[PDB]
Design a protein around this ligand. Structure first.
Ligand SMILES: Nc1nc2c(ncn2[C@H]2C[C@H](O)[C@@H](COP(=O)(O)OP(=O)(O)OP(=O)(O)O)O2)c(=O)[nH]1
Ligand SMILES: [Ca+2]
Ligand SMILES: [Ca+2]
Ligand SMILES: [Ca+2]
Ligand SMILES: [Ca+2]
Ligand SMILES: [Ca+2]
Length: 901
DNA sequence: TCGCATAAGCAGTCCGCG
DNA sequence: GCGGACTGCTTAT
């Protein structure tokens, strides 16, 4: 096989590399890599190296990496550009793997681990590590085994061995329900003392050294705890055995309000799953506890135990160990679904970076571009210092707040990356500038043509047309990957809808799910068999179809995120190719494209309807337009349609055969006007929205910018078995909104859009009457909590104290003195409840750590003093009043003359 | 919240507004 | 009460 790196490090003058050799074996080597950097040289000097602007360079070969680094310093002292890849391990990988990397994941050791630490005096601080590690479960992807290290003897209690038999039994048998599919994969090792547990763990680690190391909060908790505990018991040298090169570094992670420490293990790639999830999931969660995320992702119930975690080992060691094992398995289950490890490996190997660098789009793009340019013997410019400066972004149209009955939406495929490609925006393709007219003059095609030679953006920038820039070239490659995966995602989605339809009529038989590839649209053959399947088989097929869709979503959306990140990176001062001329060329072109095409669509529709000055485009944001289709429907007449699907077909056909060719023509003209390199503005129909045929539903509404709801029947070619709500920006979509309130508001919106005013009034009346019975967690607000100290004045709110921070200070006073009560962690999330006047907490609200039950010390007082009235008005009534006034209807029935009877 | 970008919404504080 | 100046937080794209 072709060789591939696993990890790469610079240690002084050596590159340390773990890799897979041509025989599939893991190896390690130390290489005295001689880096090359570059200086500009005279024209008379013959060379094959040129910088990105075509200026000649001489290559400087250094005796070692430190010499190269020192040379960079002296060049700065002199005041001359030191060109080339200054991150020598990236240059090493580029030299050593000069081909597209084909990797084999089965050879990559992926370790998933979790530790337990009993602590009587609150949270066990990893930097102190003063409490024994009493359990480690370490899953190894190569062995496919869970290695369980169990401490039987501790200062906090002596316990009996964990029992695998009890672990396997149902909760109803007094067991722990460790999933049967992992029971045979557990390798259990009890220890009589912590020293032997840890020594054996290190020996084990030496035999099975992780390449990718993951788990939940491992970078912030488990790794520094294990490192520091081993350090405290045995000394530094022993702790450094966690690194295959015996090198570690305390790295200080700084943010706006404070800093924290992690342990860098040289020769290991740490991909903490919490951070993978935050980057790649595109969710914003009320809590990031593993219990909360596991429930959300997998629909598994919370791991249930009595008493505090600090007493679980002594009271129920059996459950203590089983829950440690299950916790590791939960992360593997989330990854089986979401496939974030797979994504990380894909992206890292494509870019030729350390896998952990996938968290940084700047680093990722720096490596992609470097490798691309190196292939042509071109030399990358030195990174430079720039002051942070604001720059303009997208245009967003101010909508008239209203109901909107029939709506068709359109938006650009991969807008910003497509703009980059169309205009040819790149550091080395800048050709000059032209004299800019007000933006509206381009929007209206009255401004003079910018250039008859170069490709232009309305911010004043001109670009070469003779050759593609490196940025367009490399962005196109990832875009193409993205498009492939989105295709699979949409196919799985359409396939899911076929299964849902079939589930209306399940057959009474015993059969099996069909063995199919859900990434491809079901054939007629498959559709026929589906219509004969049982509900059991159909539900399993649906599950598989949805898993396939999830896998496609992960692959496509994060590739979309990467290419959009390149557009953003051009506006980040740490990017090697930072240039506000290019960043603004993208955004300003975007502003023009939207407003240009708004004008074109209005003109086209005013002509087909024979009207004048009529606005068909009601809204748009960045790269999208929302078109009122009421007049299109009314030109046919509602009574001509057999059912909802009939008018949806008509609008879909209208969008595809009339709207889109008109849109394409408008954009082709715009391309010629800007003299762009290639027409790539592809604005396809997104949504077709409206009320169910013959209902009193309103179809959709806008309250304002970035705030709307649509009843959608077809989304990017997916025809739903059941209508789906597209709700953007409203409180139903905000993690800060109480869970039960999100649900109630969504149902209010559903009723507005599908059924009408009277239905909405029925539901509001009922919700208002019953809501006090809702569980307190379900009706609590959520907020991130920053700067708790800033607003804390002797345990009380300082000036301008935010509401949620006030709540935390209330909590802090209420639990004062307790070393055991859960502490609110700076920067994490809290649940927030208002408190009625005259409560014993002495303030108007209380907050506690999100994803948790409030401590029993105060729970009862909180429940007793909860202000349901304030809660209802703020989270439910206020937003609903907003939705309904915008939509011009009433959530409460107004009096009429019929009341006289 | 270490990790690409800007636009823009709403909650809440403080305080004016005769 | 509401709204503006401001902070804080959270979305849409
Ligand atoms: N820098 C940056 N720009 C973004 C981000 N999200 C959206 N944008 C910008 C760039 C996008 O091309 C543009 C339109 O966003 P969309 O959500 O419509 O995505 P896009 O058109 O890229 O892909 P699509 O083909 O519509 O799925 O808005 C982001 O997270 N970072
Ligand atoms: Ca635990
Ligand atoms: Ca788009
Ligand atoms: Ca599309
Ligand atoms: Ca059937
Ligand atoms: Ca869009």
């Amino acid at each position: 096989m072709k060789e591939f790196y696993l990890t790469v490090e610079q240690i002084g003058d050596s590159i340390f590399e773990r890799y897979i050799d041509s025989n599939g074996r893991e190896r390690t080597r130390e290489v005295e890599y001689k880096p090359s950097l570059f200086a500009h040289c005279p024209e008379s000097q013959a060379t094959k190296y040129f910088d990105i602007y075509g200026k000649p360079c001489t290559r400087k070969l250094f005796a070692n990496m430190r010499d190269a680094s020192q040379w960079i310093k002296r060049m700065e002292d002199i005041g001359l550009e030191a060109l080339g890849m200054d991150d020598f391990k990236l240059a090493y990988l580029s030299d050593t793997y000069n081909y597209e990397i084909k990797y084999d994941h089965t050879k990559i050791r992926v370790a998933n681990f979790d530790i337990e630490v009993t602590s009587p005096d609150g949270f066990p601080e990893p930097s102190q590590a003063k409490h024994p590690i009493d359990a480690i479960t370490h899953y190894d992807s190569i062995d496919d085994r869970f290695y369980v290290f169990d401490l039987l003897n501790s200062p906090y209690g002596n316990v009996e061995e964990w029992s695998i038999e009890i672990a396997a039994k149902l909760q109803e048998q007094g067991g722990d329900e460790v999933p049967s599919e992992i029971i045979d994969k557990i390798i259990y090792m009890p220890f009589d003392n912590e020293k032997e547990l840890l020594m054996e763990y290190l020996n084990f680690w030496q035999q099975k050294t992780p390449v990718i190391l993951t788990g939940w909060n491992v970078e912030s908790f488990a790794i520094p705890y294990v490192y520091n505990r081993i350090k405290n018991i045995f000394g530094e040298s022993t702790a450094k055995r966690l690194s295959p090169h015996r090198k570690t570094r305390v790295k200080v992670i700084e943010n706006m309000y404070g800093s924290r420490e992690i342990i860098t293990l040289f020769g290991i790639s740490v991909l903490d799953y919490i951070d993978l999830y935050k980057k790649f999931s595109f969710t914003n969660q009320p809590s990031y506890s593993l219990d909360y995320i596991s429930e959300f992702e997998l629909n598994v119930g919370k791991l249930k135990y009595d008493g505090p975690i600090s007493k679980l080992r002594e009271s129920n060691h059996q459950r203590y160990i089983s829950y440690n094992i299950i916790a590791v398995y939960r992360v593997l289950q989330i990854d089986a679904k979401r496939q974030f490890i797979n994504l990380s490996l894909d992206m890292g190997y494509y870019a030729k970076i350390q896998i952990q660098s996938v968290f940084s789009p700047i680093k990722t793009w720096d490596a992609i571009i470097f490798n691309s340019l190196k292939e042509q013997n071109k030399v990358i410019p030195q990174g430079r210092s720039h002051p942070v400066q604001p720059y303009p972004g997208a245009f967003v149209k101010e909508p008239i707040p209203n109901r909107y009955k029939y709506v068709m939406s359109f938006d650009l495929t991969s807008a910003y990356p497509s703009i980059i490609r169309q205009v040819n925006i790149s550091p080395e393709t800048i050709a000059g500038t032209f004299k800019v007219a007000p933006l509206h003059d381009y929007i209206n095609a009255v401004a003079e043509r910018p250039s008859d030679v170069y490709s232009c953006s309305p911010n004043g920038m001109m670009y070469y047309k003779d050759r593609d820039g490196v940025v367009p070239t490399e962005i196109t490659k990832v875009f193409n990957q993205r498009k492939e995966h989105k295709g699979y995602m949409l196919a799985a989605q359409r396939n899911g809808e076929i299964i849902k339809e079939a589930l209306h009529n399940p057959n009474l038989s015993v059969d099996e799910p069909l063995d199919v590839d859900y990434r491809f649209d079901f054939s007629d053959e498959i559709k026929e068999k589906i219509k004969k399947l049982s509900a059991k088989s159909l539900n399993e097929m649906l599950f598989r179809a949805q898993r396939t869709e999830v896998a496609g979503m992960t692959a496509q959306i994060n590739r979309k995120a990467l290419i959009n990140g390149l557009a953003g990176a051009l506006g980040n001062v740490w990017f090697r190719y930072y240039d506000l001329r290019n960043a603004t060329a993208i955004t300003t072109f975007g502003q023009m494209a939207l407003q240009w095409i708004e004008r074109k669509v209005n003109e086209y529709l005013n002509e087909v309807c024979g009207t004048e000055g009529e606005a068909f485009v009601l809204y748009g944001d960045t790269d999208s337009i929302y078109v009122s289709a009421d007049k299109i429907i009314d030109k046919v007449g509602e009574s001509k349609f057999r059912d909802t699907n009939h008018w949806v077909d008509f609008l879909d056909k209208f969008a595809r055969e009339r709207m889109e060719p008109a849109i394409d023509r408008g954009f082709r003209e715009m391309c010629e006007y800007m003299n762009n390199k290639q027409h790539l503005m592809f604005m396809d129909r997104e949504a077709i929205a409206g009320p169910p045929l013959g209902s009193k539903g309103i179809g959709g509404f806008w309250t304002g910018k970035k705030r709307y709801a649509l009843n959608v029947w077809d989304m990017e070619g997916t025809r739903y078995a059941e209508p789906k709500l597209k709700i953007m920006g409203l409180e139903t979509q905000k993690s800060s909104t109480p869970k039960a309130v999100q649900k109630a508001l969504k149902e209010c919106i559903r009723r507005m859009l599908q059924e009408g005013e009277e239905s909405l009034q029925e539901y509001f009346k009922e919700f208002e009457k019953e809501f006090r019975q809702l569980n307190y967690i379900s009706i609590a607000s959520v907020s991130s909590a920053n700067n708790i100290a800033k607003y804390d004045v002797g345990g009380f709110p300082g000036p301008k104290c935010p509401f949620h921070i006030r709540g935390i200070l209330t909590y802090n006073r209420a639990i004062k003195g307790n070393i055991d009560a859960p502490q609110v962690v700076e920067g994490e999330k809290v649940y927030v409840l208002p408190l009625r006047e005259g409560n014993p907490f002495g303030d108007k609200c209380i907050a506690w750590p999100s994803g948790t039950e409030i401590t029993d010390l105060i729970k009862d007082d909180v429940l007793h003093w909860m202000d349901y009235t304030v809660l209802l008005e703020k989270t439910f009534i206020k937003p609903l009043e907003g939705f309904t006034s915008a939509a011009k209807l009433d959530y409460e029935k107004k009096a009429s003359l019929f009341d006289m009877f």
